[PDB]
Structure formats: structure tokens, C-alpha cells
Amino acid sequence: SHMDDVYKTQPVELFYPGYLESRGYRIPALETTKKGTVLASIDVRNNGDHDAPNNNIDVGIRRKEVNGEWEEGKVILDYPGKSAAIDTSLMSATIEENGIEKERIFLIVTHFPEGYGFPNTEGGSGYKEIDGKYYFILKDAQNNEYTVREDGIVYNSEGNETDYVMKNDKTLIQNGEEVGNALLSNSPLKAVGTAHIEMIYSDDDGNTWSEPEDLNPGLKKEWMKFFGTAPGKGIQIKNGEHKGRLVFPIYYTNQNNFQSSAVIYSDDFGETWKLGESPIDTASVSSETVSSGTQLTECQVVEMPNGQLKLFMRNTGSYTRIATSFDGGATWHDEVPEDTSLREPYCQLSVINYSGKINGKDAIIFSNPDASSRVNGSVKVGLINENGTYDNGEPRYEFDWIYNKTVKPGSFAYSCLTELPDGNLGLFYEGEGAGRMAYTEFDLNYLKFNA
Ligand SMILES: CC(=O)N[C@H]1[C@H]([C@H](O)[C@H](O)COC(C)=O)O[C@@](O)(C(=O)O)C[C@@H]1O
């Protein structure tokens, strides 16, 4: 029996094999809207649990409105064939329009054409810059280059018009008929086999979503191979000099296949994006050229009281790495320590801000498999203490890990926390077995309890 003042719901399954005709599901993401709706998005991995390639993977989402029930799941982003959309990240953000606070929900996801995934991705942005404009590259089977331009007219490398058009959905039209799709590995002209980040947004509290916008052009560097969403959530900076900025954690690989964490950020409410440096970038080390040492991969971000950023990162070492940014994620302090409270078995993790005070301190919630392996799902509570400053004027925040509660003793993999309107926490996690994506709720007391 749990203690008298404790809240913990028996886990339910929000996605499972067969649901929406999908054989497989992975990669939980969970965000709460300002209207108090919980969004749970997921990889609808149609052909099984395996990553890209050789998987028809789409984006699925479920909504639960405040004092409502889990509504039915929808596929909200679908690509031709076995082209994959993999690893989603949700972010609820607001903009003061008139004097009305308007809310937009952003989702980003990594996207690959048929035949491609992390293990075999090619390099590049997928675009050619010609006189300031970015143009979508197509390749023929003899590896010549074409670009997509005005009205989807396909130009060749000599710079002249072909008899091909590409529609937005990557459909290829030649002399009236549809002759293929640029994302399908059997198309006469193909997109570059490389990672993209695509974004969709929702203006109606998750009910409906935009068409995908490729974020690659002008953002992903030509030297990057993998370039991808760090699944979980993004955040909008609440306070400090960079209030209002959108912050989406990502990671990428260089020409040596070395993995570096970073964030992409927007100061114009998602209109344009910029790439921050990796915590891997110092004056000693460049994430472009690095080829040895601790890799920093998937990551999630929290904001300290004055707006300073903390990026928690899956990595090749034994414990979680934390990076600090003083400039809204543009750059990180040179020093990137482990937290030896946060054992890191090489798995995605979730970290979030908590809106209320806990023992009169501000707090974050963390979850991951606390073990050498993907077992022992544990949710921790971290109290934030100031303890000094930096040569540079800004406070030096440290983590007190007061609660550390096992919520799943056996298998536990990817998870994502969210704060509920009522002040409780949701957790959307892998590990219930058999492709089943589990959602549970609990309160702070649940976390205080010692087994
Ligand atoms: C493939 C992808 O885009 N993302 C996947 C990620 C990723 O391949 C990893 O971060 C890179 O490092 C490795 C492969 O060693 O790893 C997972 O395969 C896993 O479960 O670990 C699931 C996740 O969807």
C-alpha cells in the first residue's frame, strides 16, 4: 500500500500494437497547453519498433482536455511510402497579439526519405544556395544534381528547365502525369538521403496541424550528417533578456559521425530559426571537427529563475551531463560536468520546470532509467539553490536531488514528464512491454515516499 496522502494512477496504454493499424510505437512526448490540455505524441512505427530505415513511421497524437478523457488518436503527419518521421518534440508557446495572449503548439520531428536513417544518412542540408536562395536538391540515378525553384520547376545543373515539376508533397509531374515521389527510393528524381528537421504547428489547442515546414535550409550545416529532434519537449524562455525565445533541443553528427547536443531557437515566434553552439564547442574543441571524447546526444532543457538554461544530455559516459547557457542557448559555459546523482544508461531522459515551490525552493523534475541499463524508471525532484556567481555577473545554480522515486522497477526506456494544470505530474513512458506506450499520473507526495 502507498501512504495515505499519495496520488498514483495505475498506468494506462495510449498506444499499442494494432492501434491505428500500427504494428509498433515508440518515442513518447508529452506537453500541457495553457488551456490545460495534455498532448501525447508518438512515432506511429507502422512496421514494428525498429528505427528508420525500412519503416513507415508517421506522427500520432492524443489530446486529453482538462477534466476530460483521452480522445482518440490521429496521425497528424504522414509521408509517402516508408519515408520516416521519427522522434517528436512538443512545445506550447504564447505571443501577445493585440492585448490577447495567443497560444501556438509547435511540434518538430526528424525526417528521412525512404531508405535512410541515422546509420546510413548522407551529409548536407538537402539544398543548394544560388544567389542567396535555398533550393531543394534532387538527384538522378547517375548522381547528377537538379534544383527545385519557382513554381516547382526542376532546373538541371547547367541551369536550364527540365520537363519536371515537384509539388510541395514531393510529387513529381512530367508532361501531365505523376511520374513518382522525391522521397520514394524508386523515384526518377530523389531527395538527398539526409536528415531533416520538419516542423508543424497547431493554433487550435492540438485539434489540427499545419503542413510540415523543412527547417534544414539555412540551419543545418553542410558538414552535418545526422541533424535531428531530441524527442520530448521544447520550452519558451519565461524571463531574462531572452524572454519569449523558442528553444528546441536537437543533436547532430559531423563528418566523423561524432554526436553533439545543441538547441535551435527562434526570437520571432517560430518564423525563423538559428543554431546554437553545442556544449561540445569550446576554444579547444570544435563540434565540426571533433572525433574523440564524450559524445553528447539526446537532451532536454530547463530554465533557471533568472532565465539561464540547463541542458541535460544523454552521453557516452556513466552519468548525465549538464551544460549552462547565459545567452538563451547561443553558447554554453566551457565546463560540462556530470551529475553523479543522474546515472545515465545511454537512453533518452526527460527534465522539466515545475511551476510551484517545493520546500520554498524552485524545482525541476527529471525522469530516466536509473541503472546501468533501461530498467528502474525513476522520477527525481531537484531543488535549485544559488551558490555564488560567475566572473561574468550571473548566478551559479546547483541541484539538490531531494526525492528519487522508482515508478517502474523493470524495463523503462524513453519517457517525458509534463506538469498537469492541477499541479500534478504526468509521465508518458516506454517499458510496459509489447510496444505499449504507458501514461500515468502522480503527485509530489508520491515522490516523497520511500518504497
Ligand atoms: C534513430 C533515431 O533517429 N533515433 C533513435 C536513437 C538514435 O539512433 C541514437 O540516439 C543514436 O545513437 C545510436 C544509434 O547509437 O536511438 C534509439 O535507437 C534508442 O533506442 O537508443 C531510438 C531513437 O528513436
Query: Do 201 and 323 fall within a single domain?
Result: yes
Query: Do 199 and 182 fall within a single domain?
Result: no
Residues 420, 384 contacting (CB under 8 angstroms):
no
Query: Does 110 sit in the ligand 1 pocket, CB within 6 Å?
Result: yes
Query: Do 304 and 283 fall within a single domain?
Result: yes
Range of the domain at 180: 127-191
Question: Is there a domain that residue 334 lies in?
Answer: yes
Residue where one domain finishes, among candidates 166, 191, 216: 191
User: For a substitution probing ligand 1, which of 41, 43, 51 has the most ligand atoms within 8 Å of its CB?
Assistant: 51
Query: Does 251 sit in the ligand 1 pocket, CB within 6 Å?
Result: no
Query: Does 117 sit in the ligand 1 pocket, CB within 6 Å?
Result: yes
Q: How many residues in the chain?
A: 451
Catalytic residue among 164, 265, 414, 429: 414
Residues 365, 351 contacting (CB under 8 angstroms):
yes
Spatial strand order in the sheet of 213-214: 213-214, 196-202, 101-112, 84-96, 232-233
In degrees, to the nearest 5, what angle opens at C-alpha 342 toward C-alphas 336 and 348?
A: 85
Residues 348, 414 contacting (CB under 8 angstroms):
yes
Q: Which helix (H) or strand (E) holds 149?
A: none
Residue with cell 541503472: 371
Contacts of 385 by beta carbon, 8 Å cutoff, 6+ apart: 361, 397, 398, 400
Residue where one domain finishes, among candidates 191, 218, 244: 191
Query: Do 23 and 168 fall within a single domain?
Result: no
Question: Is there a domain that residue 338 lies in?
Answer: yes
* Residue from 74, 43, 64 nearest 440 by CA: 64
Residues 23, 9 contacting (CB under 8 angstroms):
no
CATH number at residue 175: 2.40.220.10
Query: Do 166 and 204 fall within a single domain?
Result: no
Separation of alpha carbons 36 and 367, rounded Å: 22
Q: State residue 448 phi and psi, 5-degree precision.
A: -65, -30
Residues 251, 87 contacting (CB under 8 angstroms):
no
Catalytic residue among 31, 58, 298, 430: 298
Q: What is the DSSP letter of 351?
A: E
Separation of alpha carbons 182 and 230, rounded Å: 26
- How many folded domains does the chain comprise? 2
Deposited resolution, Å: 2.7
In degrees, to the nearest 5, what angle opens at C-alpha 295 toward C-alphas 290 and 296?
A: 115
Question: Is there a domain that residue 220 lies in?
Answer: yes
Residue 414 is a catalytic residue: yes
**Residues paired with residue 207 on neighbouring β-strands, in sequence order:** none
Indicate which technique resolved this structure: X-ray
Residue where one domain finishes, among candidates 161, 191, 221: 191
Query: Do 141 and 119 fall within a single domain?
Result: no
Question: Is there a domain that residue 1 lies in?
Answer: no
Residues 199, 215 contacting (CB under 8 angstroms):
yes
Query: Do 208 and 181 fall within a single domain?
Result: no
Question: Is there a domain that residue 307 lies in?
Answer: yes
Other residues' Cβ atoms within 10 Å of the Cβ of residue 446: 22
Separation of alpha carbons 83 and 195, rounded Å: 11
Ligand 1: distance of its center to the CA of 298 in Å?
9
Query: Do 41 and 165 fall within a single domain?
Result: no
User: Residue 272 burial by CB count (10 A; 0-12/13-18/19+): exposed, middle or buried?
Assistant: exposed
Radius of gyration of the chain (CA): 22
Single-letter amino acid, residue 15: F
Other residues' Cβ atoms within 10 Å of the Cβ of residue 125: 24
Query: Does 370 sit in the ligand 1 pocket, CB within 6 Å?
Result: no
Separation of alpha carbons 53 and 422, rounded Å: 41
Mark residue 356 as left, alpha or beta (left: phi above 0; alpha: psi -120 to 50; beta: remaining). beta
Spatial strand order in the sheet of 375-389: 350-358, 361-369, 375-389, 395-411
